[PDB]
Design a protein around this motif. Structure first.
Motif, short mmCIF file in Angstrom:
data_model
loop_
_atom_site.label_atom_id
_atom_site.label_comp_id
_atom_site.label_asym_id
_atom_site.label_seq_id
_atom_site.Cartn_x
_atom_site.Cartn_y
_atom_site.Cartn_z
N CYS A 136 -3.72 31.07 23.75
CA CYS A 136 -2.67 30.85 24.38
C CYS A 136 -1.22 30.94 23.39
CB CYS A 136 -2.52 29.51 25.13
SG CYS A 136 -1.04 29.18 25.94
N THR A 137 -0.16 31.18 23.92
CA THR A 137 1.21 31.06 23.33
C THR A 137 1.62 29.58 23.24
OG1 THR A 137 1.47 33.23 23.93
CG2 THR A 137 3.40 31.74 23.33
N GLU A 138 1.82 28.95 22.13
CA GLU A 138 2.29 27.79 22.08
C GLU A 138 3.71 27.70 21.30
OE1 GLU A 138 -0.75 28.51 21.27
OE2 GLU A 138 -2.11 27.37 22.66
N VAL A 139 3.98 28.11 20.18
CA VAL A 139 5.34 28.01 19.31
C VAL A 139 5.43 29.07 18.22
CG1 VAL A 139 4.06 26.35 17.35
CG2 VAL A 139 6.58 25.93 18.30
N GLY A 140 6.34 29.44 18.04
CA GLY A 140 6.67 30.50 17.10
C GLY A 140 7.12 30.12 15.62
N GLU A 141 7.63 28.67 15.74
CA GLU A 141 8.14 28.16 14.35
C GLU A 141 7.16 27.72 13.39
OE1 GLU A 141 11.50 28.04 13.90
OE2 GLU A 141 11.17 27.25 11.77
N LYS A 142 6.00 27.36 13.98
CA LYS A 142 4.92 27.13 12.99
C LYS A 142 3.52 27.95 13.39
CE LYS A 142 3.70 22.82 14.73
NZ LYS A 142 4.72 22.71 15.76
N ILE A 143 3.05 29.02 12.55
CA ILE A 143 1.76 29.11 12.69
C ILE A 143 1.05 29.33 11.40
CG2 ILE A 143 0.40 31.59 13.06
CD1 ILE A 143 3.80 31.44 14.42
N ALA A 144 0.37 28.12 11.38
CA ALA A 144 -0.28 27.47 10.18
C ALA A 144 -1.46 28.50 9.65
CB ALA A 144 -0.56 26.08 10.10
N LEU A 145 -1.21 29.25 8.77
CA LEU A 145 -2.27 30.20 8.16
C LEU A 145 -3.14 29.31 7.20
CD1 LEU A 145 -0.68 32.50 9.80
CD2 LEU A 145 -1.41 33.77 7.79
N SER A 146 -4.22 29.19 7.28
CA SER A 146 -5.28 28.84 6.40
C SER A 146 -6.28 29.78 5.77
CB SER A 146 -5.89 27.49 6.65
OG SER A 146 -6.82 27.10 5.60
N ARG A 147 -6.87 29.60 4.72
CA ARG A 147 -7.65 30.53 4.17
C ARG A 147 -8.65 30.20 3.34
NH1 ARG A 147 -4.47 35.81 1.67
NH2 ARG A 147 -6.39 37.08 0.80
N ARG A 148 -9.86 30.61 2.97
CA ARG A 148 -10.75 30.19 2.18
C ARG A 148 -10.35 30.40 0.56
NH1 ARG A 148 -14.38 27.02 3.10
NH2 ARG A 148 -15.72 28.07 1.75
N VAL A 149 -10.23 29.39 -0.11
CA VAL A 149 -10.27 29.38 -1.58
C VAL A 149 -11.14 28.65 -2.37
CG1 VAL A 149 -7.58 29.98 -1.68
CG2 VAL A 149 -8.57 27.48 -1.79
N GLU A 150 -11.99 27.85 -1.74
CA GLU A 150 -13.01 26.92 -2.32
C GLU A 150 -14.12 26.64 -1.47
OE1 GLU A 150 -10.98 23.40 -3.78
OE2 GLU A 150 -10.22 23.03 -1.72
N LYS A 151 -14.93 25.57 -1.80
CA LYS A 151 -16.08 25.20 -0.69
C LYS A 151 -15.43 24.78 0.56
CE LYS A 151 -17.23 21.69 -3.13
NZ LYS A 151 -16.22 21.73 -4.27
N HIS A 152 -14.31 24.26 0.70
CA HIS A 152 -13.64 23.78 2.08
C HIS A 152 -12.31 24.69 2.13
CE1 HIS A 152 -12.53 20.85 -1.14
NE2 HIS A 152 -11.38 20.93 -0.53
N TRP A 153 -11.68 24.32 3.18
CA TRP A 153 -10.36 25.10 3.32
C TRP A 153 -9.14 24.75 2.50
CZ3 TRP A 153 -10.53 29.62 6.18
CH2 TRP A 153 -11.55 29.83 7.02
#
Lengths: 113, 16, 406
Positions: free
Chosen positions: C380-397
């Motif tokens: 769904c479409t919720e908000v444009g001001e935050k789209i919190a991109l996370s990504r693998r850099v270690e064992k966890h996020w």
């Protein structure tokens, strides 16, 4: 089944035979069968039909006597059949296919064998 | 931060 | 169900005594092999927040510190954080539209403490404004360590906003100063504004199941889940639409999106269920529908709308973004100054917490500030001001980016 049981009653009626022996070895034979179901439906005719899926559970509880539906298989449940009669089989088949043949198609849902 | 010296006297003088 | 205060817990506090000091006891929870504890989740409380003409906020017996005829009006709520330093990035997912924050400092670990502002590092983009200074060393080493340690923790408060409420030196095993802590979280923490008569919505987060074996088929059954309100206050018994709901597979058109709504009964409230959904906490939503669909684990990440809602939902996505130029806060001098945070590569897994729902992020084209992506499921479409991109850099996020709907 011969409850006219007279003509040399031996005793009172059949004494030593009827204390456990006549009763003792009936030897009935039966094989377990487990005819299943998978009905569901979706929509707002599907909200009517998911009310109608719950009352289909009610309906194969009370109308045509399928007995003791348990809740052991969390997607979809079972209905029981055991031969003391064997003629529950064609009745359960006629009603389950009457369900698939007139009940579900009027309410636009998913079900098969 | 007066809360800290309140601890420092009373809490640590009476409890751990 | 009143406040979504956050908390930032690193290693080795003693957590059941502090959380159960501010939440009473744990809920009866169940259905193991749950979801991994670095993902999205929410807290709860079996207590309430009040006073008795008293700094002390006891548990609901009305005499034992003294009397004060407690106000059975509301119930306190909470947001979970277990006691390990791993609990950074999903909490910063949660540090956007929650209510306030706790701030946990020990003395068991390094006294020139590394982790706290390693933890608290979104004091600009999202909201991080209401905290407390909280020393957790009264136990092992006495007044010398605490003496230098109050200068240590006041060496934090300067531009890094670490001064929201001053020092409380405790060990919560003694449950000490919880009269003073409760006085702070009554008075010194406010309640932010809401909206009331807005049309309510919800995105589903934490599903359940209530048909264990051993009952009849004539029972009332359905789909119970978890959630928390972003807008409106949700009553009982109306057209509660979920707009795509199921992933519409082999969907050949636009009007081939299925009209599916429901009703509702249970809205769990620690002792009761107020049928108007009390926001500011975990709400115990249970749907009317009896499918294989929602009452399984199949449904996390769908909307709660009504008939004729506004958002149209397909996959056409384009996002404008930027990045973070180190791994946030982590700097260890013993061979850790190359935890490199690399630019968005083509066809790479992400976590795009658009609003408050975890869907994995796929990407399709990379420019320096904007990106055209396609996503793993209809979202769904919720908000444009935050789209919190996370990504693998270690064992966890870890979280890496900030986004914008274009």
């Amino acid at each position: 089944d011969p409850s006219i049981l007279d003509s040399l009653d031996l005793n009172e009626d059949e004494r030593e035979v009827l204390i456990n022996n006549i009763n003792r070895r009936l030897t009935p034979q039966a094989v377990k069968i487990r005819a299943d179901i998978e009905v569901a439906c979706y929509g707002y005719e599907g909200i009517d039909a998911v009310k109608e899926a719950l009352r289909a559970g009610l309906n194969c509880s009370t109308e045509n006597m399928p007995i003791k539906i348990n809740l052991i298989a969390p997607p979809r449940y079972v209905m029981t059949t055991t031969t003391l009669e064997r003629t529950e089989g064609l009745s359960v088949l006629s009603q389950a296919m009457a369900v698939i043949k007139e009940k579900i198609e009027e309410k636009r849902g998913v079900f098969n064998v | 931060d007066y809360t800290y010296e309140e601890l420092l006297n009373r809490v640590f003088n009476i409890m751990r | 169900a009143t406040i979504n205060i956050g908390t930032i817990g690193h290693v080795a506090h003693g957590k059941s005594t502090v959380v159960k000091a501010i939440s009473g006891v744990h809920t009866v929870r169940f259905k193991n092999e749950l979801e991994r504890n670095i993902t999205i989740k929410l807290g709860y409380a079996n207590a309430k927040i009040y006073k008795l003409d008293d700094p002390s906020c006891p548990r609901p017996e009305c005499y034992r510190g003294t009397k004060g005829n407690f106000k059975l009006v509301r119930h306190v709520s909470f947001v979970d954080c277990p006691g390990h330093d791993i609990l950074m990035a999903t909490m910063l997912n949660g540090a956007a539209v929650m209510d306030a924050a706790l701030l946990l400092i020990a003395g068991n670990e390094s006294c020139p403490q590394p982790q706290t502002s390693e933890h608290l590092a979104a004091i600009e983009i999202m909201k991080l404004k209401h905290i407390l200074i909280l020393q957790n060393k009264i136990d092992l080493v006495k007044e010398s360590q605490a003496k230098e340690q109050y200068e240590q923790i006041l060496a934090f408060v300067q531009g890094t906003v670490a001064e929201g409420a001053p020092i409380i030196p405790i060990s919560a095993q003694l449950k000490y100063n919880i009269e003073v802590v409760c006085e702070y979280i009554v008075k010194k923490i406010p309640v932010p504004p809401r909206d009331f008569t807005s049309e309510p919505r919800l995105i589903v987060i934490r599903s359940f199941d209530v048909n264990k074996p051993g009952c009849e088929v004539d029972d009332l059954k359905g789909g119970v889940a978890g959630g928390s309100i972003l807008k409106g206050v949700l009553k009982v018994g109306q057209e509660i639409e979920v707009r795509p709901g199921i992933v519409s597979k082999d969907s050949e058109g636009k009007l081939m999106c299925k009209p599916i709504f429901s009703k509702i009964v249970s809205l769990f409230a620690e002792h009761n269920d107020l049928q108007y959904a009390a926001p500011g906490g975990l709400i115990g939503v249970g749907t009317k529908i009896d499918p294989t669909l929602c009452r399984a684990d199949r449904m996390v990440g769908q909307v709660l709308g009504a008939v004729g809602a506004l958002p149209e939902i397909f996959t056409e996505l384009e996002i404008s973004y930027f990045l973070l130029r180190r791994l946030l806060g982590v700097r260890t001098e013993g061979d850790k100054k190359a935890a490199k945070v690399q630019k968005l590569s083509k066809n790479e897994v992400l976590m795009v917490n658009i609003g408050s729902l975890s869907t994995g992020g796929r990407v399709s084209a990379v420019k320096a500030d904007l990106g055209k992506i396609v996503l793993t499921n209809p979202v769904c479409t919720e908000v444009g001001e935050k789209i919190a991109l996370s990504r693998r850099v270690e064992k966890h996020w870890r979280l890496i980016g900030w986004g914008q709907i274009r």
